[PDB]
Ligand binder design. Structure first.
Ligand SMILES: [Zn+2]
Length: 404
């Protein structure tokens, strides 16, 4: 289909215009890091020449924005880790990429080490630890670096996350007080606060990165116990019978302190960020890292269930849309050689032309919610060799069974 080409071309036009006119532009979420990945993934196509040029332009632009306004964050989705991920594949092509990457890496270590030092536990909020803004996301990038000089950093973060699964105010740790919720409306959903149970912002994300850390060579008894405790909490608060393979977004103090779910949710959905699809990654990675066939078998059922149901799905975006679910299924097939999701993947690719044309102008061009995320997904069905590490940003680990 020649429609990816037209669409890409118009994304380049918008970004060529912007790159001679905002914090947002430098983020993986909505900005150039995402556009760089999308374009870099299209190398086999005829216009890779032009694409590498735009990529190099957009990198130029990024470094002069950094060397003027600096960086405030090391985060995967808003900061240095996402900028570094978007160009990691380019490292050995020229020293300009290597130098820039080394700068990003020193900044990250500085930033992480500084964030851990100043951390106040009874002010814990998801951007502290999570995938989008916190350490889990940062570690996801760092584990791609083999240079042994980041070992202490890796374990510093691993211990820190593990420690957050310990009991506190009686029992607690990763529990978020109501005033510590990310948004006004969330403070109001959870007047007594909660344990966030999503991949993007909650316990599943922390669990995944610890399983992935283990298989990359980075674990101890404390982290393996943390992983275990997390999967144990997922096994415990799983909803029942007809709501089987479902979890609420958050568990509240008393639910936790009585070990049974009490009040029922208003809105559960099937997303990468919250719900079954994301949660299946925890079971998959726990299962594989812990050598537990039950966990692995179950991850499959959790995802299979979500694909059948598509709860709250009304777009093709990555974060909480159908492209997200589809990409998680593609990972299962890569790691397990399962055929369980083959019809869902087939159907999506059959429908591709329509997906792009009806994609809103409304959610922008960016990775996490915009059309370029969707183009990444489509592009790797068409040509499955990944030139980039984009999937790392979603905790989709193609190297999970490659060793250390
Ligand atoms: Zn989302």
């Amino acid at each position: 289909k020649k429609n990816i080409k037209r669409n890409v071309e118009k994304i380049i036009a918008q970004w060529d215009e912007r790159t001679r006119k905002d914090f947002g532009e430098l983020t993986l979420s909505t900005g150039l890091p995402g556009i760089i990945l999308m374009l870099a993934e299209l190398k086999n196509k005829d216009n890779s020449k032009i694409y590498q040029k735009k990529i190099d332009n957009y990198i130029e632009y990024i470094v002069s924005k950094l060397s003027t306004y600096g960086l405030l964050t090391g985060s995967l989705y808003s900061g240095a880790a996402g900028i570094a991920l978007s160009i990691l594949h380019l490292r050995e092509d020229d020293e300009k990429y290597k130098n820039l990457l080394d700068s990003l890496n020193r900044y990250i270590e500085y930033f992480v080490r500084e964030k851990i030092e100043g951390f106040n536990l009874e002010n814990i909020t998801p951007p502290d630890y999570d995938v989008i803004e916190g350490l889990s996301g940062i570690l996801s990038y760092l584990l791609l670096i083999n240079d042994e000089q980041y070992d202490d950093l890796k374990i510093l973060i691993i211990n820190f996350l593990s420690n957050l699964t310990k009991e506190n105010n009686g029992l607690i740790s990763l529990y978020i007080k109501s005033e510590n919720q990310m948004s006004q409306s969330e403070s109001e959903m959870y007047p007594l606060g909660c344990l966030n149970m999503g991949l993007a912002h909650g316990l599943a994300g922390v669990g995944c990165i610890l399983a992935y850390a283990h298989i990359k060579g980075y674990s101890n008894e404390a982290s393996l116990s943390a992983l275990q405790k997390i999967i144990f909490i997922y096994e415990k608060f799983e909803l029942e019978r007809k709501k089987q393979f479902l979890w609420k977004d958050g568990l509240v103090a008393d639910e936790l302190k009585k070990e049974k779910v009490i009040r029922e949710a208003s809105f559960i959905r099937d997303a990468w960020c919250y719900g079954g699809p994301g949660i299946s990654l925890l079971y998959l990675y726990g299962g594989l890292a812990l050598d537990n066939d039950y966990f692995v078998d179950k991850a499959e059922k959790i995802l299979e269930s979500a694909m059948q149901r598509k709860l709250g799905i009304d777009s093709y975006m990555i974060c909480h849309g159908y492209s997200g679910l589809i990409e998680i299924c593609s990972l299962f097939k890569r790691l397990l050689n399962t055929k369980k999701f083959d019809s869902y993947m087939e159907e999506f690719n059959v429908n591709s032309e329509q997906i792009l044309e009806e994609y809103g102008d409304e959610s922008g061009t960016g990775f996490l919610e915009g059309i370029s995320g969707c183009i990444l997904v489509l592009s790797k069905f068409e040509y499955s060799i990944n030139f980039t590490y984009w999937r790392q940003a979603l905790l989709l680990f193609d190297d999970f069974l490659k060793g250390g």
